[PDB]
Design a binder for this molecule. Structure first.
Ligand SMILES: [Mg+2]
Ligand SMILES: [Mg+2]
Ligand SMILES: [Mg+2]
Ligand SMILES: [Mg+2]
Ligand SMILES: [Mg+2]
Ligand SMILES: [Mg+2]
Ligand SMILES: [Mg+2]
Ligand SMILES: [Mg+2]
Ligand SMILES: [Mg+2]
Ligand SMILES: [Mg+2]
Ligand SMILES: [Mg+2]
Ligand SMILES: [Mg+2]
Ligand SMILES: [Mg+2]
Ligand SMILES: [Mg+2]
Ligand SMILES: [Mg+2]
Ligand SMILES: [Mg+2]
Ligand SMILES: [Mg+2]
Ligand SMILES: [Mg+2]
Ligand SMILES: [Mg+2]
Ligand SMILES: [Mg+2]
Ligand SMILES: [Mg+2]
Ligand SMILES: [Mg+2]
Ligand SMILES: [Mg+2]
Ligand SMILES: [Mg+2]
Ligand SMILES: [Mg+2]
Ligand SMILES: [Mg+2]
Ligand SMILES: [Mg+2]
Ligand SMILES: [Mg+2]
Ligand SMILES: [Mg+2]
Ligand SMILES: [Mg+2]
Ligand SMILES: [Mg+2]
Ligand SMILES: [Mg+2]
Ligand SMILES: [Mg+2]
Ligand SMILES: [Mg+2]
Ligand SMILES: [Mg+2]
Ligand SMILES: [Mg+2]
Ligand SMILES: [Mg+2]
Ligand SMILES: [Mg+2]
Ligand SMILES: [Mg+2]
Ligand SMILES: [Mg+2]
Ligand SMILES: [Mg+2]
Ligand SMILES: [Mg+2]
Ligand SMILES: [Mg+2]
Ligand SMILES: [Mg+2]
Ligand SMILES: [Mg+2]
Ligand SMILES: [Mg+2]
Ligand SMILES: [Mg+2]
Ligand SMILES: [Mg+2]
Ligand SMILES: [Mg+2]
Ligand SMILES: [Mg+2]
Ligand SMILES: [Mg+2]
Ligand SMILES: [Mg+2]
Ligand SMILES: [Mg+2]
Ligand SMILES: [Mg+2]
Ligand SMILES: [Mg+2]
Ligand SMILES: [Mg+2]
Ligand SMILES: [Mg+2]
Ligand SMILES: [Mg+2]
Ligand SMILES: [Mg+2]
Ligand SMILES: [Mg+2]
Ligand SMILES: [Mg+2]
Ligand SMILES: [Mg+2]
Ligand SMILES: [Mg+2]
Ligand SMILES: [Mg+2]
Ligand SMILES: [Mg+2]
Ligand SMILES: [Mg+2]
Ligand SMILES: [Mg+2]
Ligand SMILES: [Mg+2]
Ligand SMILES: [Mg+2]
Ligand SMILES: [Mg+2]
Ligand SMILES: [Mg+2]
Ligand SMILES: [Mg+2]
Ligand SMILES: [Mg+2]
Ligand SMILES: [Mg+2]
Ligand SMILES: [Mg+2]
Ligand SMILES: [Mg+2]
Ligand SMILES: [Mg+2]
Ligand SMILES: [Mg+2]
Ligand SMILES: [Mg+2]
Ligand SMILES: [Mg+2]
Ligand SMILES: [Mg+2]
Ligand SMILES: [Mg+2]
Ligand SMILES: [Mg+2]
Ligand SMILES: [Mg+2]
Ligand SMILES: [Mg+2]
Ligand SMILES: [Mg+2]
Ligand SMILES: [Mg+2]
Ligand SMILES: [Mg+2]
Ligand SMILES: [Mg+2]
Ligand SMILES: [Mg+2]
Ligand SMILES: [Mg+2]
Ligand SMILES: [Mg+2]
Ligand SMILES: [Mg+2]
Ligand SMILES: [Mg+2]
Ligand SMILES: [Mg+2]
Ligand SMILES: [Mg+2]
Ligand SMILES: [Mg+2]
Ligand SMILES: [Mg+2]
Ligand SMILES: [Mg+2]
Ligand SMILES: [Mg+2]
Ligand SMILES: [Mg+2]
Ligand SMILES: [Mg+2]
Ligand SMILES: [Mg+2]
Ligand SMILES: [Mg+2]
Ligand SMILES: [Mg+2]
Ligand SMILES: [Mg+2]
Ligand SMILES: [Mg+2]
Ligand SMILES: [Mg+2]
Ligand SMILES: [Mg+2]
Ligand SMILES: [Mg+2]
Ligand SMILES: [Mg+2]
Ligand SMILES: [Mg+2]
Ligand SMILES: [Mg+2]
Ligand SMILES: [Mg+2]
Ligand SMILES: [Mg+2]
Ligand SMILES: [Mg+2]
Ligand SMILES: [Mg+2]
Ligand SMILES: [Mg+2]
Ligand SMILES: [Mg+2]
Ligand SMILES: [Mg+2]
Ligand SMILES: [Mg+2]
Ligand SMILES: [Mg+2]
Ligand SMILES: [Mg+2]
Ligand SMILES: [Mg+2]
Ligand SMILES: [Mg+2]
Ligand SMILES: [Mg+2]
Ligand SMILES: [Mg+2]
Ligand SMILES: [Mg+2]
Ligand SMILES: [Mg+2]
Ligand SMILES: [Mg+2]
Ligand SMILES: [Mg+2]
Ligand SMILES: [Mg+2]
Ligand SMILES: [Mg+2]
Ligand SMILES: [Mg+2]
Ligand SMILES: [Mg+2]
Ligand SMILES: [Mg+2]
Ligand SMILES: [Mg+2]
Ligand SMILES: [Mg+2]
Ligand SMILES: [Mg+2]
Ligand SMILES: [Mg+2]
Ligand SMILES: [Mg+2]
Ligand SMILES: [Mg+2]
Ligand SMILES: [Mg+2]
Ligand SMILES: [Mg+2]
Ligand SMILES: [Mg+2]
Ligand SMILES: [Mg+2]
Ligand SMILES: [Mg+2]
Ligand SMILES: [Mg+2]
Ligand SMILES: [Mg+2]
Ligand SMILES: [Mg+2]
Ligand SMILES: [Mg+2]
Ligand SMILES: [Mg+2]
Ligand SMILES: [Mg+2]
Ligand SMILES: [Mg+2]
Ligand SMILES: [Mg+2]
Ligand SMILES: [Mg+2]
Ligand SMILES: [Mg+2]
Ligand SMILES: [Mg+2]
Ligand SMILES: [Mg+2]
Ligand SMILES: [Mg+2]
Ligand SMILES: [Mg+2]
Lengths: 274, 47
RNA sequence: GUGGGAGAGGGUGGUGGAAUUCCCGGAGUAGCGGUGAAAUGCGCAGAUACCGGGAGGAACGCCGAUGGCGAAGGCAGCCACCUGGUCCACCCGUGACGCUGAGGCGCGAAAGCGUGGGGAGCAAACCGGAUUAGAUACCCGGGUAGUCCACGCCCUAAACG
RNA sequence: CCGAGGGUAGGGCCCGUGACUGGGGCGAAGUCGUAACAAGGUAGCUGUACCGGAAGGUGCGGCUGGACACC
RNA sequence: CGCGGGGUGGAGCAGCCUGGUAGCUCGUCGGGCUCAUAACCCGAAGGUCGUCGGUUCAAAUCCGGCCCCCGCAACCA
RNA sequence: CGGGGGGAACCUGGGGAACUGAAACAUCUCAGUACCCAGAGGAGAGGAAAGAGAAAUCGACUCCCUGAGUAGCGGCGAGCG
RNA sequence: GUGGUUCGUGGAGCCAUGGGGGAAUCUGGGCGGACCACCGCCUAAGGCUAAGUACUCCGGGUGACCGAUAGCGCACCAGUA
RNA sequence: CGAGCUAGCCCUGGCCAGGGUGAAGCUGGGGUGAGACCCAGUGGAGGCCCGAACCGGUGGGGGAUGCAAACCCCUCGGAUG
RNA sequence: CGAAUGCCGGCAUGAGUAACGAUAAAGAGGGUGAGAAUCCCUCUCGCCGUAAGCCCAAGGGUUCCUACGCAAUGGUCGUCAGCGUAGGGUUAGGCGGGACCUAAGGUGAAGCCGAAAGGCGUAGCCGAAGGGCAGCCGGUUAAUAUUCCGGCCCUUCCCGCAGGUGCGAUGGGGGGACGCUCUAGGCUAGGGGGACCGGAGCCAUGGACGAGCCCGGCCAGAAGCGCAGGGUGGGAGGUAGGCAAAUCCGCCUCCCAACAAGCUCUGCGUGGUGGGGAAGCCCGUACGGGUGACAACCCCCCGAAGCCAGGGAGCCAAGAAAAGCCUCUAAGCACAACCUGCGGGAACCCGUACCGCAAACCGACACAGGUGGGCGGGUGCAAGAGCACUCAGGCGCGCGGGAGAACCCUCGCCAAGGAACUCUGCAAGUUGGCCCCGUAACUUCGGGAGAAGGGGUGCUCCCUGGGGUGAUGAGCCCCGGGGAGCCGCAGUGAACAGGCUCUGGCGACUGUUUACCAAAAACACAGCUCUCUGCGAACUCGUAAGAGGAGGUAUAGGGAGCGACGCUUGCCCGGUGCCGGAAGGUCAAGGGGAGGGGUGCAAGCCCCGAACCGAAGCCCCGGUGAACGGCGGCCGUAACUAUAACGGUCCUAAGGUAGCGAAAUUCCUUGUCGGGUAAGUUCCGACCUGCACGAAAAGCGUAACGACCGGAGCGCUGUCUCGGCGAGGGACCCGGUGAAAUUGAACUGGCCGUGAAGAUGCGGCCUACCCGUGGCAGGACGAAAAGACCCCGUGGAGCUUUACUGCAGC
RNA sequence: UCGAUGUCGGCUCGUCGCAUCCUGGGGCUGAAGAAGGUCCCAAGGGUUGGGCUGUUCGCCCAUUAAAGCGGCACGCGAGCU
């Protein structure tokens, strides 16, 4: 839980660093399982399609396993819990008895040294993975497939988790970390436990620069801009928003629901966070 | 103070070069015009 | 010491049923609520009353006492674990090892505070209805903190026998 | 050398004093309401929180120094 | 100087727009309930409508002048 | 066996402006212009009537003259034709 | 739904076609300016086709065309410095 | 036709004299029922301090047909981010 | 052609005027020559020395070297040159690139998309200042040299012979292979000292023949060894993974090592050997050649940021790829092939001169500007790349000579006074390094702090402590301690080196910005809140394909406000926006065909067309304030007066709460009172009558921070009373070179009038010989810019919206 | 005067008018003296330093013989700010 510093600088006071004692490995990662990556914020047109992005530490991309099922039945021992810079969570190194090594996103309370399996067979125990249909109702669960054999989409982020409310036909009813209630297909693998590194939400960046290390560049408000630039700008000596609050592209930003209406996905949802 | 001409022999060739022009219909036209005018150099000479 | 006892004593983890609220489904119609009487509110966009389903939070009816336990504050569905105090019996050990206690340390209802969660019912503040001379009240309809949980503070009380 | 003392500098404490400001005491017959004393006309008091011209109200918990009809 | 709304029983408001009649709350006065006062009940009274012209048959009402009232504007310099 | 690329202008096809004019400006004009693209050649396009359009008439296409600034079209404006 | 024509939605036919529907083979089908009848014209949904036409890098001939501030930007080692 | 200037991002390299301050941690002693803690040492943190290179451009003077189409002198900001 | 600030060209005026481009600086002797301040040589003097010296990369493109030249180019001169003419000059298997690798990106069989041109895209290919790879020290030329020569090493191909082995790749596996800060041990680079080794010579001017003075005391070097390091377990069994196959790698188990013990690689050292090798003196050099010599060739110390190197720790932001290389097997081959060693042979292309912090590059210039990497010695000052002087090396900045006015610039100093200067201490000055003493409010406990204020500071002799390296010894080097003394105005003796305090505003803070008039209180910022987004996410770019988002998944991502932290952020949902609403109303195409029309003999063809069913939207119903926003008026009242806790009445969706308030907001206004001052429109503290504060366009505070803006004191001053003198660079004079804007023409005076209303030019009068030089700016409505303000134009453009009308989007 | 007549204040340098602030000279006085009042003559000379504000102006402090008012493109930016 959250290293803190004395204020021997300003901004050292409220700054706060993650507790790494969970980390059993450091300075790997298994060199067999990871390439590199790049971006800039820019798309293939050389064009910024997401603003305020770049700088930030060089990163190696640890390749991780979002299908647990291709390996049904082969257990594995957990060799390490290390540091993934490309996500909120920590990755678990697991050696299979296959002699195969894979990375997994590491559940809260997964001990280095224990055994994990995936398949309809599996014990309901932290780290294991099953078709949703075979997890008992009420089980809190993470890394969920949205569609069968397509990979883990839902609840991957530090401290997230999901819950099985019940079952209907080929579908089980899930509460997502949004709180929305969703029907997910029975056949969808999911791995029991919550995601952990839960204390993630409590770090305090604490100085400007630390926000840069994460490759987030400064964010300038419409509010201080000229009219060419933004629906909020000009005339100054400040100003209220002078109109219903808008994005730079002009659509409204307090209240407007942007989810498409006619999505087939709609007949599989029952609730609200969006 | 630093000025607008900072020659670099490679930048010149990949920019205004002969295969640069040839690569794009705008540029093929550049040559076309340049050639039709009777230009001695169709494209900057870079050592 | 030995052997035995009663008990909401404290901590952790689970777990059960009643009820309230909301959501879905069925059925069904012209009211329902609420009061001293009303009004605000809710209701033909199908309410209330009825059955079926699901979600969730809080509190534990009878037993219950005019009872029990703890130093106090305090402690009440059920189960397990860890753990305190205390009474009895037998006369077995030590041999004055006692009492009290300025300071110190620790505990300490409710409210309140900090960072997370959770939020059904309740409900300061707030709004509306009514009463009144007026009502920044009492009654009624709404209702956010809070109430609950983890950690951390605060250290008050008709903390009373 | 030490040395009364003078000088320059920076602190401590104590008295007096100050536009204004806070509440307090006192003052034969001022204005506003009725909080308490009798179930005081909402039992009261209470720690704490919020609110309100004012006494006070309400929440939560607490104390009694409060309780012959009747369902 | 400018534009806009205004001035009505003691107070505060309607009525004027669209001519004919002046209305609502409080206050005031008379009576009542009460030991008494207020509350409350029953009754009354009070106004020429800023002022001076003008229009009409008739003017708070429509038009003009002056007096005041509130508001707005007074920029480039 | 053929294609590719180049050619002053000219030609056909795919796309296609604005200034301007309307004494402001939207329809309208400029204008199917400028320009970009593809193709063709020494030409290119067109071409042998499911045509004209009132005469029981003319007969493929293209180019000039005329018909004619006529029929018309038109914020029935400017103007187009 | 549009484009073309003089046709700007107009009585708007004709020619073309992006969408929907969707025939017949001579007694069949298209047109003559919405539509109807009559009377005429013509035979769509395959293709080719000289010449009369356009142009001028190039060669020639000619000039009430210039004569070095003209005439091409260049009479000259100019699309150069 | 331009990102050989200037702006941002991407890939891959390089640069930052010297001094100063002394965070966590560790160790040891004290402390206690076990703690929190305390002190000493070690340690070497930081959009920390002073200040060159480098990067700036605060104030003033000079320049003003300039050395210069933004320069010069003095001073001044940052200087492991 | 006379006018167009016309066009092209020529030539004037300013005018022998301003300048002649860093204030590092010159003097003489000799030489050459038609000609010399300016070329060559010597001597003296000055300037650079973390450079203004040397090397590399860009870029430049013969500028290089030499002979002959001086018309132009050179800011003067030129006999010189980077200039003209000519001739010469650049040498590589090992240095850099390429017959290697891959990075971003580019390109692109497959594929996808797009009217056309074209856009995309896996693999592949291309792409380097990154990975990989074999050369070090001398000598030589006028001019190239890791290139040629000398010497000692080395690499890859081809072929052969010997030995060895299941050989074999583009396929599997390993490796390559990685951050930032701190950093150990050993070395090397470099450097200082030496009484020791080698060396021409020197005794000056009072002294010194000296353990004097001055110069030098190295460099490369295979094998072997030695020291310091890097890397690295061995064997068996099992095996289902590493898209086939493995004997390899992964995983489980068993067995010995824990250690560099071996094996292995690299650094230094030493190494057969090769080579350098000063002062000074003679000569002769754009330059360097003999001797010194047969040179010496050694000890000590200092010591990297470099090396061993994938070293070590710590920390969080979590730190390229591919080949080379090794291994493993597959076909295929086992005659082959590969492996190790030796040997012969073969080893291509392009760069190579010269400039390179600049007179050769970018700036029209031989421009005080800009330009990436490496070396960058000595001493002294705490250290240091700082500063002063100085080595090697390089330079005196391509107009000079005089004079010693005003004035200007840059600099020095001043009686008494000390901010009186002024918008303002602007500017200058004070302060200044190190050591020691000491140090307040306040505080988020870190700070505030270099707070403030002080004391010390040199040289000499005496005694003494610990460290490093040697040995636990001297010597060398480092850090000190105590005592007695000497000198001056003064010891950080020159140079580099904070003035301080009180107190308000605003922004928490470090940061960022208007290149080139604003660095700020603006932007950013951690952090808070709202909102959207279930993932083929929302959102963005694109016609599309595709991409970003993100190889992310609600502890995430997008949008928007607010802007550390503290304490807080009230009321109004009427309008607007959004959100919810399965009824209702209306609503387009379409469906429907009541009825009506055209025409036909007619069958028919054809054209209308009411009911009714029929989306979104709008209306309607609610909700919603860290959504756009909004948060009253009049009148009365208390036993002095005043004032109004209280009441009355109109309107509202609701009437501004807490805080704060003459404010970055207050008009009246220099409000009133207090404070500070002899005096205070500012400043601070109050009051509240807030024209016209007020709670995330956030309210009130807040330690710390600030080249922000305001107020006050101390200190100190030429800021001032109030000026004076002095220095240098201009200005002036002489010789050389010689511009510019401007310019209707000029023979160009004052006053009072006049005049288109401000006259050298008209009237009257006055004054006035001709022509310059140095000076000052009153005038020529002086120069410059076809006024930016203002208006006009049915002129433009950027911006906004409940202007109009479209369009994209939904 | 818009093909440019730079705008407040300050500083510097002045010069002029007199409707005189002082000094000289006078008349009247409700002028005893001294000291004032008020008007007349008179432009020779003189007319302070400082606090506040950008200020002109004004208020204020300390003095003075006095602490004058105007003009000169609200004199003066090819003179400075
Ligand atoms: Mg591109
Ligand atoms: Mg921002
Ligand atoms: Mg702006
Ligand atoms: Mg833009
Ligand atoms: Mg906009
Ligand atoms: Mg705005
Ligand atoms: Mg503005
Ligand atoms: Mg504003
Ligand atoms: Mg240029
Ligand atoms: Mg290049
Ligand atoms: Mg040629
Ligand atoms: Mg018990
Ligand atoms: Mg006993
Ligand atoms: Mg005994
Ligand atoms: Mg408590
Ligand atoms: Mg509580
Ligand atoms: Mg009551
Ligand atoms: Mg009470
Ligand atoms: Mg009472
Ligand atoms: Mg009561
Ligand atoms: Mg209440
Ligand atoms: Mg009465
Ligand atoms: Mg304006
Ligand atoms: Mg066409
Ligand atoms: Mg027009
Ligand atoms: Mg026009
Ligand atoms: Mg117009
Ligand atoms: Mg047209
Ligand atoms: Mg033809
Ligand atoms: Mg036309
Ligand atoms: Mg048409
Ligand atoms: Mg029309
Ligand atoms: Mg038509
Ligand atoms: Mg027929
Ligand atoms: Mg037919
Ligand atoms: Mg047809
Ligand atoms: Mg026809
Ligand atoms: Mg017809
Ligand atoms: Mg026909
Ligand atoms: Mg010809
Ligand atoms: Mg000519
Ligand atoms: Mg001639
Ligand atoms: Mg010509
Ligand atoms: Mg760039
Ligand atoms: Mg350092
Ligand atoms: Mg340091
Ligand atoms: Mg440090
Ligand atoms: Mg720093
Ligand atoms: Mg730079
Ligand atoms: Mg400057
Ligand atoms: Mg700069
Ligand atoms: Mg000047
Ligand atoms: Mg900084
Ligand atoms: Mg600094
Ligand atoms: Mg530094
Ligand atoms: Mg960085
Ligand atoms: Mg003329
Ligand atoms: Mg001119
Ligand atoms: Mg001349
Ligand atoms: Mg002259
Ligand atoms: Mg001169
Ligand atoms: Mg010079
Ligand atoms: Mg001679
Ligand atoms: Mg040096
Ligand atoms: Mg030369
Ligand atoms: Mg010459
Ligand atoms: Mg010359
Ligand atoms: Mg080859
Ligand atoms: Mg390649
Ligand atoms: Mg492409
Ligand atoms: Mg390379
Ligand atoms: Mg090489
Ligand atoms: Mg050499
Ligand atoms: Mg040394
Ligand atoms: Mg002698
Ligand atoms: Mg050696
Ligand atoms: Mg295997
Ligand atoms: Mg296999
Ligand atoms: Mg050696
Ligand atoms: Mg390491
Ligand atoms: Mg090691
Ligand atoms: Mg093998
Ligand atoms: Mg085989
Ligand atoms: Mg060479
Ligand atoms: Mg330089
Ligand atoms: Mg350099
Ligand atoms: Mg040079
Ligand atoms: Mg050059
Ligand atoms: Mg220039
Ligand atoms: Mg020069
Ligand atoms: Mg230069
Ligand atoms: Mg140059
Ligand atoms: Mg530089
Ligand atoms: Mg020093
Ligand atoms: Mg160095
Ligand atoms: Mg220096
Ligand atoms: Mg001179
Ligand atoms: Mg002088
Ligand atoms: Mg003085
Ligand atoms: Mg003094
Ligand atoms: Mg002032
Ligand atoms: Mg200063
Ligand atoms: Mg103090
Ligand atoms: Mg000091
Ligand atoms: Mg001394
Ligand atoms: Mg001395
Ligand atoms: Mg040593
Ligand atoms: Mg100094
Ligand atoms: Mg300093
Ligand atoms: Mg202020
Ligand atoms: Mg700031
Ligand atoms: Mg900014
Ligand atoms: Mg600008
Ligand atoms: Mg600027
Ligand atoms: Mg700044
Ligand atoms: Mg600036
Ligand atoms: Mg789109
Ligand atoms: Mg991705
Ligand atoms: Mg803001
Ligand atoms: Mg703020
Ligand atoms: Mg609010
Ligand atoms: Mg309120
Ligand atoms: Mg509202
Ligand atoms: Mg509403
Ligand atoms: Mg609303
Ligand atoms: Mg409906
Ligand atoms: Mg009929
Ligand atoms: Mg609808
Ligand atoms: Mg509503
Ligand atoms: Mg009174
Ligand atoms: Mg005030
Ligand atoms: Mg004031
Ligand atoms: Mg205000
Ligand atoms: Mg004021
Ligand atoms: Mg104040
Ligand atoms: Mg405000
Ligand atoms: Mg607000
Ligand atoms: Mg404030
Ligand atoms: Mg503050
Ligand atoms: Mg700063
Ligand atoms: Mg600042
Ligand atoms: Mg002076
Ligand atoms: Mg004359
Ligand atoms: Mg005159
Ligand atoms: Mg005359
Ligand atoms: Mg003048
Ligand atoms: Mg003038
Ligand atoms: Mg004009
Ligand atoms: Mg108009
Ligand atoms: Mg216009
Ligand atoms: Mg003008
Ligand atoms: Mg002028
Ligand atoms: Mg007079
Ligand atoms: Mg007298
Ligand atoms: Mg006078
Ligand atoms: Mg004034
Ligand atoms: Mg005065
Ligand atoms: Mg003036
Ligand atoms: Mg000026
Ligand atoms: Mg002025
Ligand atoms: Mg002037």
């Amino acid at each position: 839980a959250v290293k803190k510093f004395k204020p021997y600088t300003p901004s050292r006071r409220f700054m706060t660093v993650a507790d790494f004692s969970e980390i059993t490995k450091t300075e790997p990662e298994k060199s067999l399982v990871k390439p590199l990556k790049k971006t800039g914020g820019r798309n293939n047109q050389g064009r910024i399609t997401v603003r305020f992005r770049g700088g930030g530490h060089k990163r190696l991309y640890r390749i991780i396993d979002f299908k647990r099922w291709d390996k049904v039945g082969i257990p594995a021992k957990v060799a390490a819990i290390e540091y993934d810079p490309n996500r909120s969570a920590r990755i678990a190194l697991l050696h299979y008895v296959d002699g195969e090594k894979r990375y997994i996103i590491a559940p809260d309370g997964l001990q280095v040294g224990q055994q994990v399996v995936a398949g309809p067979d599996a014990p309901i125990q932290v780290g294991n993975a099953l078709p949703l249909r075979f997890i008992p109702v009420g089980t809190v669960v993470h890394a969920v497939e949205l569609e069968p054999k397509k990979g883990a989409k839902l609840a991957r982020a530090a401290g997230t988790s999901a819950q099985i409310q019940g079952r209907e036909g080929d579908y089980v009813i899930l509460r997502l970390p949004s709180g929305e209630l969703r029907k997910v297909h029975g056949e969808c693998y999911a791995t029991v436990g919550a995601v952990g590194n839960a204390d993630h939400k409590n770090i305090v960046l604490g100085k400007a620069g630390r926000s840069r290390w994460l490759g987030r560049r400064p964010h300038v408000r419409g509010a201080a801009m000229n009219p060419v630039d933004h629906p909020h700008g000009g005339g100054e000596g400040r100003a209220p928003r002078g109109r219903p609050p808008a994005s730079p592209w002009g659509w409204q930003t307090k209240g407007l629901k942007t989810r498409k209406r006619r999505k087939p996905s709609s007949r599989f949802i029952i609730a609200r966070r969006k | 103070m630093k000025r607008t001409w900072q020659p670099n022999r490679r930048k010149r060739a990949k920019t205004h070069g002969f295969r640069a022009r040839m690569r794009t219909p705008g540029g093929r036209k550049v040559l076309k015009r340049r050639r039709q005018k009777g230009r001695w150099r169709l494209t900057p000479a870079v050592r």
